[PDB]
Amino acid sequence: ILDYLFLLDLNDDLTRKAVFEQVIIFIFIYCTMNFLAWSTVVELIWPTHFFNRRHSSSQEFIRFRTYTEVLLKISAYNDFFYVLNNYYYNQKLILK
Amino acid sequence: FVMYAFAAKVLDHLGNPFPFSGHGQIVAAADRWNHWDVRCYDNVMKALKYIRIPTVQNNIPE
Amino acid sequence: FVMYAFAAKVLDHLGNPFPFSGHGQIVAAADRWNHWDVRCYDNVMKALKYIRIPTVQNNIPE
Amino acid sequence: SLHEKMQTDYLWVKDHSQADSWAKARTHGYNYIAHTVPNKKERYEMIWRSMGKSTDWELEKFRLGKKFPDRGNKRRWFKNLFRLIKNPMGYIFWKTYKARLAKPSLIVTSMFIGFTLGFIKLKAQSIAYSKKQYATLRAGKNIEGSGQVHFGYHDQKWGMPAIPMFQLMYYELPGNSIVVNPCRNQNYRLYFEMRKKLGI
Amino acid sequence: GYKIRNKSIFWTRAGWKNNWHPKNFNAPRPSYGEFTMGIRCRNDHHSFLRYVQTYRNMSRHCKQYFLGDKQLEETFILGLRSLFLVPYDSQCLTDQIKHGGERRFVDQLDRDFELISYNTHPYQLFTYTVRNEHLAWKNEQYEKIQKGEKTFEQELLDYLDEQVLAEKAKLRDGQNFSIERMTEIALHVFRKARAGKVRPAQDVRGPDGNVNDFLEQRRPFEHPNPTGVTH
Ligand SMILES: CCCCCCCCCCCCCCCCCC(=O)OC[C@H](COP(=O)([O-])OCC(O)COP(=O)([O-])OC[C@@H](COC(=O)CCCCCCCCCCCCCCCCC)OC(=O)CCCCCCCCCCCCCCCCC)OC(=O)CCCCCCCCCCCCCCCCC
Ligand SMILES: CCCCCCCCCCCCCCCCCC(=O)OC[C@H](COP(=O)([O-])OCC(O)COP(=O)([O-])OC[C@@H](COC(=O)CCCCCCCCCCCCCCCCC)OC(=O)CCCCCCCCCCCCCCCCC)OC(=O)CCCCCCCCCCCCCCCCC
Ligand SMILES: CCCCCCCCCCCCCCCCCC(=O)OC[C@H](COP(=O)([O-])OCC(O)COP(=O)([O-])OC[C@@H](COC(=O)CCCCCCCCCCCCCCCCC)OC(=O)CCCCCCCCCCCCCCCCC)OC(=O)CCCCCCCCCCCCCCCCC
Ligand SMILES: CCCCCCCCCCCCCCCCCC(=O)OC[C@H](COP(=O)([O-])OCC(O)COP(=O)([O-])OC[C@@H](COC(=O)CCCCCCCCCCCCCCCCC)OC(=O)CCCCCCCCCCCCCCCCC)OC(=O)CCCCCCCCCCCCCCCCC
């Protein structure tokens, strides 16, 4: 009911400023430009991460286990890993 | 083949398959409400109705 | 460099270096024998001398 | 896997022709020959070897036998057209992958896009000028020739040079800015006075 | 294999392999009390206790969704410690970091716990997926053992036990059954078993140089039109 709702009018905007119809064009363009730029910056951290986690280790340093490698080793081993461990344990620790 | 037959049905009305090239063609019924909201404008009536005949002095009417 | 300098001397008269493009430009002396063998033709005189002024009825003179 | 055969068939199209099922019609490679590759002469030797093994190196049998075209290349232009319509961006992406491995600079890419979009912009204005000439024709002025590059004694307007100097001084006429005068809204005063007179 | 040939690969303007204090123009400089009027600094001595509280928060808030799985809690602890032990073992001199390494890591871990408190951290979602896939396989084995059936893992273990007896019964000249020989016996059985399963193609190229995909169908053309469904 208040006069603040008059701002929703675009039929007669040419009677006050007629500026809204041109500024939102820039805002849509500015959003598109930042979409292309920011998506490039954030997404392109993967080639560095994919390379470092696979080539940055050296034999004169200790490679320490990360969180994901702790969970995968303990809670995501396959059947062959389970067999090979017990196969080594039964033959050498039990049966000698 | 099916989409080619369906495009044939549409292209009878659309005409030109390329974009930004032409307009579709639809024959509509003639009633009293044709152009009802532009009857006030004179230049719209002249552009729609009148095909003027060029004279020897080839100019737009003064 | 020498042929380029010599071509500069010629192009002051020839003008356009490409073939089938234009004509050379030579300023000649005005004497009584200019166009002496085509003085009989009337259309040659009108093409050379007269720059007609187009009117509102834009047509060649009848 | 379980859903592999169903999904692979749903994703891509296979060849339905059995052109190579017929033995003698199979080509030796002499129908579509590569002419400029550096191993060109090795291709011809393999074609010759294929022709010699088919006749046990008695090529008179090939001369008397019938020669066939490459039936496997039939309707290949139509099949590529249908893939281009089915997935135009996927067809363009994979057909240009090897070419897009070499990426030009940001400047060259910007020049390609700028001149291409600038050319389309001039084409759009050229189309709009043709509608102006049609309105001029209907208004009673017959038109000899066409275009706006006046040969005679008239002023021309070439169109905005697509460089920042002219793009800062000039801008095209926005049709949406030509409006009805707002004094039209003052006619509504007649309605408010009539409603009060009629006791509405 | 292949080694980096550039000898100056790890050279920076601040030294060899320096990723703790890179060289820049605005370098840190000391402040003198007698000459300093006022100062605006955000450094403090609160990172130590914030480091302790952050570990307790991350541990306790993640254990909310473990459903009392004791093995998962102990596994998560080992993983959580590996995240907090980064500055203590890294090659980077975390004590020589530009503007305080302790503050930097504490603020970095607080961003992790904020995601953990909402149960949206990717390490959490990865843990639930890995644990569900693990328990589904353990439940499959339990149902086969209750039914008196032998699990696939026991069949290989029993098959591998009789292979060692057969090899050590024929190898009488030498009596040193090394772990190398024990390994290649199992791997020979593992390859044969892996090749027996109907697995999706993992390697790019099969026995030939050609790829093992569904797209690797070239001429000759010998397939007819696709047939429809049967009634
Ligand atoms: C008495 C009353 C009745 C009177 C009847 C009178 C008429 C007689 C009827 C019969 C006439 C023909 C006689 C029998 C011929 C049989 C020959 C044969 O064995 O098959 C050869 C031929 C072999 O083809 P193929 O080996 O399988 O593959 C072709 C190659 O592999 C190549 O494949 P490709 O992938 O490489 O593509 C290239 C291809 C075609 O590629 C193209 O580029 C052509 C593009 C055409 C389509 C685009 C047109 C552009 C306008 C539309 C735009 C499309 C936009 C789509 C995209 C949207 C926008 C992005 O090149 C060709 O042109 C191939 C055409 C056949 C070769 C003939 C020599 C061609 C040179 C002449 C070229 C000019 C004509 C082209 C017409 C093309 C029609 C297919 O097959 C046929 O020609 C089939 C035709 C038989 C159809 C019978 C239909 C029923 C007949 C009755 C119809 C009634 C009509 C009534 C008319 C009324 C009067 C107006
Ligand atoms: C050479 C330089 C000059 C080139 C000039 C350009 C040529 C014309 C291009 C005009 C572009 C208009 C774009 C239309 C909208 C497309 C938007 C889209 O997302 O497309 C995806 C869309 C696929 O998505 P989908 O909807 O899921 O369809 C797949 C379904 O599985 C469908 O089921 P299905 O797979 O089982 O069906 C078989 C499949 C394969 O079968 C075929 O493709 C053969 C059928 C050919 C029929 C003849 C087509 C003639 C043109 C279409 C009809 C005229 C225009 C109709 C209205 C189009 C505008 C919506 O058919 C299809 O792929 C879809 C059917 C195609 C449309 C058929 C029906 C037409 C009427 C549509 C009615 C709805 C709108 C009402 C009218 C609105 C008017 C206001 O593709 C299309 O539908 C057609 C795209 C055609 C545009 C590509 C043309 C070639 C590329 C242009 C040149 C590029 C140069 C740039 C190079 C840059 C290098 C860096
Ligand atoms: C065209 C010949 C005459 C026609 C007769 C037909 C001849 C038959 C052949 C025709 C068939 C092929 C056509 C040519 C294709 C190009 C050849 C090729 O494939 O080579 C591989 C070629 C790889 O190049 P490369 O030599 O191996 O290595 C380049 C290195 O990166 C770095 O190399 P760099 O460091 O040494 O130098 C950098 C730069 C070299 O610097 C440049 O190339 C300068 C380019 C500056 C801009 C030029 C704009 C062209 C004017 C277009 C404006 C409209 C035309 C009308 C208005 C102007 C009138 C003149 O590299 C290049 O760009 C290499 C391309 C150079 C030759 C091609 C240039 C063609 C320009 C047109 C000439 C005039 C045509 C007039 C139009 C006639 C119409 C009647 O593929 C490319 O990537 C370059 C092509 C351009 C790609 C630029 C990025 C475009 C991205 C667009 C994204 C937006 C698209 C959105 C999707 C659309 C909707 C779905
Ligand atoms: C704390 C340090 C500072 C802060 C650091 C933080 C910076 C963050 C960097 C993050 C990078 C952005 C990440 C997203 C971009 C990815 C997409 C991309 O565009 O990469 C291009 C990508 C990389 O290009 P590149 O071949 O590797 O060359 C890279 C560099 O150019 C290098 O190659 P180059 O060495 O051979 O280049 C030589 C250079 C040599 O240049 C020079 O030696 C001197 C240059 C002086 C410029 C003179 C200015 C004159 C001004 C006159 C103005 C008059 C008119 C003004 C009218 C206004 C109203 C009055 O000349 C150039 O060619 C420069 C390239 C064009 C530069 C355009 C911007 C210039 C100003 C940059 C503002 C930033 C200032 C930072 C402060 C730095 C202070 C040290 O190539 C592509 O084109 C593929 C993408 C397709 C793009 C086509 C469409 C582009 C539009 C969309 C782009 C994305 C949205 C917009 C983002 C910003 C783009 C302008």
GROMACS .gro file of N, CA and C in nm, chain C:
model
  186
  159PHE      N    1   6.691  -0.120  -5.474
  159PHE     CA    2   6.671   0.020  -5.439
  159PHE      C    3   6.674   0.109  -5.563
  160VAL      N    4   6.759   0.076  -5.660
  160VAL     CA    5   6.768   0.157  -5.781
  160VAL      C    6   6.642   0.141  -5.866
  161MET      N    7   6.595   0.018  -5.883
  161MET     CA    8   6.472  -0.003  -5.958
  161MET      C    9   6.351   0.057  -5.887
  162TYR      N   10   6.351   0.056  -5.754
  162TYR     CA   11   6.244   0.122  -5.681
  162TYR      C   12   6.246   0.272  -5.705
  163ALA      N   13   6.365   0.331  -5.711
  163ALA     CA   14   6.376   0.474  -5.740
  163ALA      C   15   6.334   0.503  -5.883
  164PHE      N   16   6.368   0.415  -5.976
  164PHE     CA   17   6.327   0.434  -6.114
  164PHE      C   18   6.177   0.414  -6.130
  165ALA      N   19   6.119   0.321  -6.054
  165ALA     CA   20   5.974   0.304  -6.056
  165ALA      C   21   5.902   0.425  -5.999
  166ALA      N   22   5.964   0.494  -5.903
  166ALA     CA   23   5.907   0.617  -5.851
  166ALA      C   24   5.900   0.725  -5.957
  167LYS      N   25   5.998   0.728  -6.047
  167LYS     CA   26   5.997   0.827  -6.154
  167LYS      C   27   5.884   0.799  -6.252
  168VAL      N   28   5.857   0.672  -6.280
  168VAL     CA   29   5.753   0.637  -6.376
  168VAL      C   30   5.615   0.654  -6.314
  169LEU      N   31   5.599   0.614  -6.188
  169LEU     CA   32   5.468   0.619  -6.124
  169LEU      C   33   5.417   0.761  -6.103
  170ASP      N   34   5.504   0.862  -6.114
  170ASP     CA   35   5.455   0.999  -6.115
  170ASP      C   36   5.366   1.026  -6.235
  171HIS      N   37   5.381   0.949  -6.342
  171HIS     CA   38   5.296   0.961  -6.460
  171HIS      C   39   5.195   0.848  -6.471
  172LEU      N   40   5.236   0.725  -6.441
  172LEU     CA   41   5.147   0.610  -6.457
  172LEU      C   42   5.041   0.606  -6.348
  173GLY      N   43   5.078   0.642  -6.226
  173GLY     CA   44   4.982   0.650  -6.117
  173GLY      C   45   4.956   0.518  -6.047
  174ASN      N   46   4.880   0.430  -6.112
  174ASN     CA   47   4.845   0.302  -6.053
  174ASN      C   48   4.939   0.193  -6.103
  175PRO      N   49   5.012   0.125  -6.015
  175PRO     CA   50   5.105   0.021  -6.061
  175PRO      C   51   5.038  -0.107  -6.105
  176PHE      N   52   4.913  -0.130  -6.067
  176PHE     CA   53   4.847  -0.253  -6.106
  176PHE      C   54   4.790  -0.241  -6.247
  177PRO      N   55   4.792  -0.350  -6.322
  177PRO     CA   56   4.735  -0.348  -6.457
  177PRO      C   57   4.583  -0.352  -6.456
  178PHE      N   58   4.526  -0.300  -6.565
  178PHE     CA   59   4.382  -0.295  -6.586
  178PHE      C   60   4.310  -0.221  -6.474
  179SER      N   61   4.377  -0.125  -6.411
  179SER     CA   62   4.320  -0.052  -6.299
  179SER      C   63   4.284   0.092  -6.333
  180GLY      N   64   4.376   0.168  -6.389
  180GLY     CA   65   4.349   0.306  -6.426
  180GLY      C   66   4.429   0.348  -6.546
  181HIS      N   67   4.453   0.478  -6.556
  181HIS     CA   68   4.531   0.536  -6.664
  181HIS      C   69   4.639   0.628  -6.609
  182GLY      N   70   4.746   0.642  -6.686
  182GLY     CA   71   4.846   0.741  -6.655
  182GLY      C   72   4.794   0.882  -6.673
  183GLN      N   73   4.865   0.977  -6.614
  183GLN     CA   74   4.827   1.117  -6.615
  183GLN      C   75   4.941   1.200  -6.673
  184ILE      N   76   4.916   1.258  -6.790
  184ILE     CA   77   5.012   1.344  -6.859
  184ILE      C   78   4.943   1.474  -6.894
  185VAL      N   79   4.999   1.586  -6.850
  185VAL     CA   80   4.947   1.718  -6.885
  185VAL      C   81   5.015   1.762  -7.014
  186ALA      N   82   4.934   1.791  -7.115
  186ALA     CA   83   4.983   1.826  -7.247
  186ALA      C   84   4.948   1.971  -7.280
  187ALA      N   85   5.014   2.022  -7.383
  187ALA     CA   86   4.993   2.159  -7.426
  187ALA      C   87   4.863   2.171  -7.504
  188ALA      N   88   4.798   2.286  -7.489
  188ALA     CA   89   4.673   2.315  -7.556
  188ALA      C   90   4.701   2.389  -7.686
  189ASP      N   91   4.673   2.325  -7.798
  189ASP     CA   92   4.693   2.385  -7.929
  189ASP      C   93   4.567   2.370  -8.012
  190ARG      N   94   4.571   2.424  -8.134
  190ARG     CA   95   4.456   2.419  -8.223
  190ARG      C   96   4.435   2.280  -8.281
  191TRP      N   97   4.532   2.191  -8.267
  191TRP     CA   98   4.525   2.057  -8.323
  191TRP      C   99   4.485   1.953  -8.219
  192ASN      N  100   4.444   1.996  -8.100
  192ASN     CA  101   4.391   1.902  -8.002
  192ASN      C  102   4.259   1.846  -8.051
  193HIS      N  103   4.248   1.714  -8.054
  193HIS     CA  104   4.128   1.646  -8.100
  193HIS      C  105   4.090   1.687  -8.241
  194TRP      N  106   4.190   1.715  -8.325
  194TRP     CA  107   4.163   1.772  -8.456
  194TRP      C  108   4.085   1.676  -8.545
  195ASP      N  109   4.105   1.546  -8.529
  195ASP     CA  110   4.042   1.449  -8.617
  195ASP      C  111   3.909   1.396  -8.564
  196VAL      N  112   3.863   1.446  -8.450
  196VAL     CA  113   3.732   1.411  -8.397
  196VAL      C  114   3.645   1.534  -8.375
  197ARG      N  115   3.682   1.648  -8.436
  197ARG     CA  116   3.599   1.767  -8.422
  197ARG      C  117   3.462   1.749  -8.485
  198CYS      N  118   3.448   1.655  -8.577
  198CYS     CA  119   3.320   1.635  -8.643
  198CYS      C  120   3.217   1.577  -8.548
  199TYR      N  121   3.259   1.492  -8.455
  199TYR     CA  122   3.166   1.422  -8.369
  199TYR      C  123   3.116   1.514  -8.259
  200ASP      N  124   2.984   1.518  -8.240
  200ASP     CA  125   2.923   1.604  -8.140
  200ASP      C  126   2.923   1.541  -8.001
  201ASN      N  127   2.903   1.410  -7.993
  201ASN     CA  128   2.899   1.343  -7.864
  201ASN      C  129   3.035   1.342  -7.796
  202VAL      N  130   3.143   1.347  -7.873
  202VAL     CA  131   3.276   1.357  -7.813
  202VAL      C  132   3.294   1.493  -7.748
  203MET      N  133   3.239   1.598  -7.809
  203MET     CA  134   3.251   1.731  -7.751
  203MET      C  135   3.171   1.742  -7.622
  204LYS      N  136   3.050   1.687  -7.620
  204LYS     CA  137   2.968   1.695  -7.500
  204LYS      C  138   3.027   1.615  -7.385
  205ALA      N  139   3.091   1.502  -7.416
  205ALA     CA  140   3.151   1.421  -7.311
  205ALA      C  141   3.275   1.486  -7.251
  206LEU      N  142   3.346   1.565  -7.330
  206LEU     CA  143   3.470   1.628  -7.285
  206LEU      C  144   3.446   1.761  -7.216
  207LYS      N  145   3.352   1.840  -7.266
  207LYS     CA  146   3.339   1.980  -7.228
  207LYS      C  147   3.236   2.004  -7.120
  208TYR      N  148   3.120   1.939  -7.130
  208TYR     CA  149   3.002   1.977  -7.054
  208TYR      C  150   2.983   1.884  -6.935
  209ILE      N  151   2.969   1.943  -6.817
  209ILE     CA  152   2.930   1.873  -6.696
  209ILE      C  153   2.790   1.922  -6.662
  210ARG      N  154   2.689   1.848  -6.705
  210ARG     CA  155   2.552   1.894  -6.689
  210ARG      C  156   2.509   1.885  -6.544
  211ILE      N  157   2.415   1.972  -6.508
  211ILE     CA  158   2.367   1.985  -6.371
  211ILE      C  159   2.237   1.906  -6.359
  212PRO      N  160   2.231   1.803  -6.276
  212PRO     CA  161   2.105   1.729  -6.260
  212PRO      C  162   2.000   1.813  -6.190
  213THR      N  163   1.877   1.800  -6.237
  213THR     CA  164   1.766   1.876  -6.184
  213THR      C  165   1.683   1.790  -6.090
  214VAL      N  166   1.572   1.846  -6.042
  214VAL     CA  167   1.485   1.771  -5.951
  214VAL      C  168   1.424   1.652  -6.023
  215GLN      N  169   1.375   1.672  -6.145
  215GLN     CA  170   1.337   1.561  -6.230
  215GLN      C  171   1.464   1.497  -6.283
  216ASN      N  172   1.518   1.403  -6.207
  216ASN     CA  173   1.650   1.348  -6.232
  216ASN      C  174   1.652   1.258  -6.354
  217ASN      N  175   1.670   1.316  -6.472
  217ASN     CA  176   1.673   1.241  -6.596
  217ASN      C  177   1.774   1.305  -6.690
  218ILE      N  178   1.826   1.222  -6.781
  218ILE     CA  179   1.905   1.276  -6.891
  218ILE      C  180   1.818   1.370  -6.974
  219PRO      N  181   1.871   1.480  -7.027
  219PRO     CA  182   1.791   1.567  -7.112
  219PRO      C  183   1.726   1.489  -7.226
  220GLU      N  184   1.600   1.524  -7.254
  220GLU     CA  185   1.522   1.449  -7.351
  220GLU      C  186   1.583   1.456  -7.491
   0.00000   0.00000   0.00000
